[PDB]
Design a protein around this ligand. Structure first.
Ligand SMILES: NCCCC[C@H](N)C(=O)OP(=O)(O)OC[C@H]1O[C@@H](n2cnc3c(N)ncnc32)[C@H](O)[C@@H]1O
Length: 481
């Protein structure tokens, strides 16, 4: 019973966080889109004018309000804050997602309204008219996580959890030179993906300024670089597949780089970590509020996912459910202040259960394999529903890493594909900065024959709405184009 990581946090709401910042930094720039540039004082005024409209419709605690507003716009973030201010919880769907996914989420969340680009629209449910403002027990957001084999499911996160996450991160990044007025935070992640909550509060927890960018820009590295320099961005939170394809010097003047959501390739550390830039790995399921553990990424060190945030508790366990010893691998379990819940009672019953190991009623079973060391966890891969090639269980991450390690490759992803006749091919998709016949030879020296993937060059790797790699979207079968 050695792989247990424990921690000791003051409960409050996200409105408490914003209002404390606004009180301390009333004249600092909170939100900056070029067109509009709002001090914290004017941000609150604009928030209140929008929240008043929602209250007039009866929206308050207990209500769920959809948000479907284009990225990179002031109104997107003003609308989210307006919902929170009114005491309701917001339910974000990316504007560029399909209308079909949007209808599913809003129906499944039972929203009483959705904020569209030209004003409020109807929601399947009706507001409940509670006049109170939110307390820590009230939901702040409901974010859908795609899952692992089924359809995406709604995760409801309380203000207490969301605030605990934001306050936890205030003890983590840049302790030597804290975030504050003068820092300028990119907001480029989809609001449907809860890492965008990290973006938002990396500004609003400290009196720094949020600088939204449209999602398309974040996927276009040659255009993003000049834009970040122009905007004076100092803080970037992103996803490895996105950043992999960015121009190397697209992070100059960025002093805090955070990656999360999928495995951070060793090469990204080599590209960005060093004196004058804190680079951090962050790991966490939507089910335990954005981030559960983090590690500084430094050159010459293995990539770790790290140690728990203040309020999170981690256990690594065998099949038996008992904690493994240091050096061993096991499934990661998470409890503490960040554990959320599923909307669907049945889904909640199978993922949140008591576990004697951590001694808590609600423990989230992540389904992730990790290796436990006293200085931090190392991510391994799936603990269940593992990819099969033929009949053999394989870990894609090891193939991803071997492809990324090739000379002349900026980014790579593997996939087990099914041929039209119904057999299987392991394919390695590679974005060259590269000689194919010579890359294959290197793969043959480092991988068992059955794990040497068929190589395919591609100009970029497709991403999901969150920014993680979209393996289903990689080209297949392989054109000679
Ligand atoms: N900076 C904020 C980051 C927040 C990430 C977000 N909460 C999230 O990813 O949540 P989900 O979209 O629900 O899926 C979580 C699952 O993705 C994998 N994962 C997340 N971070 C990872 C990391 N740093 N390294 C390797 N794998 C990671 C895990 O399989 C994890 O179960």
């Amino acid at each position: 019973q050695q792989a247990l990581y424990r921690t000791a946090p003051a409960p409050r709401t996200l409105l408490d966080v914003l209002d404390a910042t606004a009180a301390a930094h009333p004249q600092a720039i909170a939100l900056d889109t070029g067109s509009e540039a709002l001090t914290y004082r004017d941000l609150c005024i604009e928030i209140e004018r929008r929240a008043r409209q929602l209250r007039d419709r009866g929206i308050g605690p207990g209500d769920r309000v959809g948000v479907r507003v284009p990225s990179g716009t002031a109104e997107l973030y003003l609308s989210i804050l307006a919902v929170l201010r009114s005491g309701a919880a917001y339910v974000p769907v990316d504007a560029d997602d399909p209308d079909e996914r949007a209808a599913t989420v809003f129906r499944e969340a039972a929203v009483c309204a959705v904020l569209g680009p030209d004003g409020p629209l109807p929601g399947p449910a009706r507001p409940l008219g509670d006049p109170r403002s939110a307390g820590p027990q009230d939901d702040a957001w409901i974010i859908f996580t795609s899952g692992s084999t089924g359809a995406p499911k709604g995760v409801a996160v309380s203000h207490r959890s969301a605030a605990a996450f934001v306050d936890a991160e205030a003890d983590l990044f840049c302790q030597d030179q804290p975030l504050g007025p003068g820092d300028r935070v990119l907001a480029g992640l989809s609001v449907a993906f809860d890492a965008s909550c990290e973006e938002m509060w990396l500004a609003w927890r400290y009196g720094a300024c949020l600088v939204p960018a449209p999602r398309a820009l974040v996927r276009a590295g040659h255009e993003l670089g000049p834009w970040l320099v122009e905007r004076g961005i100092t803080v970037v939170s992103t996803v490895p597949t996105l950043a992999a394809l960015w121009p190397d010097e697209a992070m100059r003047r960025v002093r805090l780089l955070i990656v999360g959501g999928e495995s951070c390739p060793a090469g990204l550390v080599d590209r960005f970590a060093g004196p004058g830039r804190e680079m951090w790995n962050t790991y966490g399921p939507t089910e335990t509020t954005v981030v559960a553990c983090a590690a500084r990424l430094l050159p010459g060190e293995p990539v770790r996912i790290g140690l728990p945030l203040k309020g999170w508790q981690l256990a690594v366990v065998d099949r038996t459910g008992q904690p493994v010893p240091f050096g061993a691998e096991g499934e990661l379990l998470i409890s503490g202040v960040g554990t959320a819940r599923y909307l669907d009672p049945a889904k909640d019953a199978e993922r949140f259960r008591p576990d004697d190991a951590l001694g808590a009623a609600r423990v989230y079973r992540t389904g992730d394999l990790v290796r436990a060391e006293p200085e931090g966890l190392l991510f391994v891969g799936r603990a269940d529903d593992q990819i099969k090639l033929g009949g053999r269980r394989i870990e894609l991450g090891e193939i991803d890493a071997a492809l990324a390690a090739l000379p002349g490759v900026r980014g790579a992803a593997a996939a087990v594909q099914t041929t039209p006749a119904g057999t299987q091919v392991l394919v390695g998709y590679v974005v060259p900065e590269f000689q194919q016949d010579k890359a294959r030879a290197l793969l043959q020296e480092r991988l068992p024959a059955q794990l040497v993937p068929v190589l395919a060059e591609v100009e970029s790797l497709p991403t999901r709405t969150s920014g993680k790699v979209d393996r289903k979207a990689l080209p297949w079968p392989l054109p000679s184009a």
